[PDB]
């Protein structure tokens, strides 16, 4: 195979330098295939609390890399492309959070993991799409401030029956903005398929699906549902992961959806990352000290 040169040197350097490679489900297939651990944000977070390796090569977006570093302040965490980021996460600011706390002083601030680390210092608790409902449901308040994703926050309100005040205005992920007409069409084409969509999808898409969950939840659905075909309403990288786990099922994208930021990581720049041991994820000590609190609380409110 024409990529063997890069694959081989990645595997040699990883072993030589004492790295573990962690990847998100939306990384390109070639990188998922060289990673030691591939999963969703919640799975990556739990892995980050548990791993023993002194050095971590993280393959995803910056807020995830930073969470891994917050949970491992004394380990070296590197990323191939320091600009890989989540634009949705980036629209929420400290300024907005403080405005809404004042406006709603007894509402806890619940931040989606897709948020800047500075913003996380201001949060009462963090959540991911897999545990957002459980986390908010276990809080002792009928109103919560939630951001940055309006769709997830609305989904939380539905499932919990609580009032969810979303910040900022119109926070959403462009990648998950499917039209519900694509489900209609796919029902005609594959009448016995099961439709699985992300909670970041708009309400009409969520409401027409058979299942709604994080990518980690998506991967467990075929363990209990015997359907021959699943239609997947998330970023394209998940198709590879699903097909690999369940080669006897068919996985069909709801629509082709690509996260440009998740695609910034390549075999070539991942090799360079191992060769140079760059770019290190560095945070102020204060940010780590402060952002760790709502991350650890997330885990307390699961069990």
In angstroms, give the least distance from the CB of 177 to ligand SF4. 10
Reduced to 3 states (helix: H, G, I; strand: E, B; else coil), residue 129 is coil
Which segment (49-57, 84-92, 186-194, 239-247) binds ligand SF4 by CB under 6 A?
Answer: 84-92
Residues 6+ apart with CB under 8 A from 271: 6, 9, 10, 13
235 touches ligand SF4 (CB under 6 A) = yes
Cis omega before residue 148 (within 30°)? yes
What is the C-alpha to C-alpha distance for residues 149 and 129, in angstroms, rounded to an integer?
Answer: 10
Assigned token pair, 181? 């007409």
Q: Angle of helix 41-50 relative to helix 62-70, nearest 10 degrees?
A: 30
Residue 89 near residue 117 (C-beta atoms within 8 A) = no
Applying the rule CB under 6 A, the residues between 184 and 213 that interact with ligand SF4 are none
In angstroms, give the least distance from the CB of 24 to ligand SF4. 8
Known binding positions: 24, 41, 86, 112-114, 129, 173, 198-200, 215, 259
Assigned token pair, 218? 């998506």
Q: Which of 88, 135, 238, 291 binds ligand SF4 (CB under 6 A)?
A: 88
Known binding positions for [4Fe-4S] cluster: 86, 173, 259
Reduced to 3 states (helix: H, G, I; strand: E, B; else coil), residue 78 is strand
In angstroms, give the least distance from the CB of 12 to ligand SF4. 30
Q: Which of 77, 109, 175, 232 binds ligand SF4 (CB under 6 A)?
A: 175
Q: Which of 86, 136, 164, 167 binds ligand SF4 (CB under 6 A)?
A: 86
Applying the rule CB under 6 A, the residues between 33 and 62 that interact with ligand SF4 are 61
Q: Give me the residues paired with residue 126 across strands.
A: 111
Assigned token pair, 153? 């926050």
Q: What is the DSSP letter of 167?
A: -
Q: Which of 65, 70, 262, 267 binds ligand SF4 (CB under 6 A)?
A: 262
Q: Which is nearer to ligand SF4, 136 or 175 (CB)?
A: 175
Catalog residues that contact ligand SF4 under the rule CB under 6 A: 61, 86-88, 114, 173, 175, 235, 259, 261-262
């Amino acid at each position: 195979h024409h990529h063997h040169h890069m694959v081989d040197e990645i595997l040699k350097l990883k072993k030589e330098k004492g790295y573990i490679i962690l990847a998100h489900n939306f990384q390109i297939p070639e990188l998922q295939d060289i990673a030691d651990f591939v999963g969703d944000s919640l799975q990556l977070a739990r892995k980050a609390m548990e791993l023993s390796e002194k050095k971590i090569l993280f393959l995803g977006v910056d807020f995830m890399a930073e969470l891994v570093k917050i949970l491992n302040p004394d380990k070296k965490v590197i990323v191939p492309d320091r600009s890989a980021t989540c634009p949705m996460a980036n629209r929420l600011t400290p300024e907005i959070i403080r405005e809404y706390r004042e406006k709603f002083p007894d509402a806890p601030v619940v931040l989606y993991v897709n948020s800047t680390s500075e913003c996380k210092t201001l949060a009462d608790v963090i959540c991911t799409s897999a545990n957002a409902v459980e986390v908010v449901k276990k809080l002792d308040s009928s109103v919560v401030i939630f951001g940055p994703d309006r769709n997830l926050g609305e989904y939380v309100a539905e499932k919990t029956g609580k009032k969810v005040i979303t910040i900022p205005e119109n926070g959403h992920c462009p990648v998950h903005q499917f039209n519900a007409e694509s489900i209609d069409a796919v029902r005609k084409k594959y009448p016995d398929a099961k439709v699985i969509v992300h909670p970041e999808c708009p309400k009409p898409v969520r409401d027409k699906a058979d299942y709604v969950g994080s990518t980690g939840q998506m991967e467990k659905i075929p363990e209990r549902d015997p359907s021959r075909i699943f239609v997947i309403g998330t970023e394209i990288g998940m198709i590879h992961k699903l097909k690999k786990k369940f080669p006897d099922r068919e996985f069909v994208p709801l629509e082709m959806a690509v996260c440009v930021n998740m695609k910034k990581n390549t075999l070539e720049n991942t090799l360079h990352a191992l060769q140079t041991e760059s770019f290190e994820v560095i945070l102020p000590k204060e940010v780590i000290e402060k952002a760790k609190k709502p991350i650890l609380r997330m885990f307390e409110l699961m069990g």
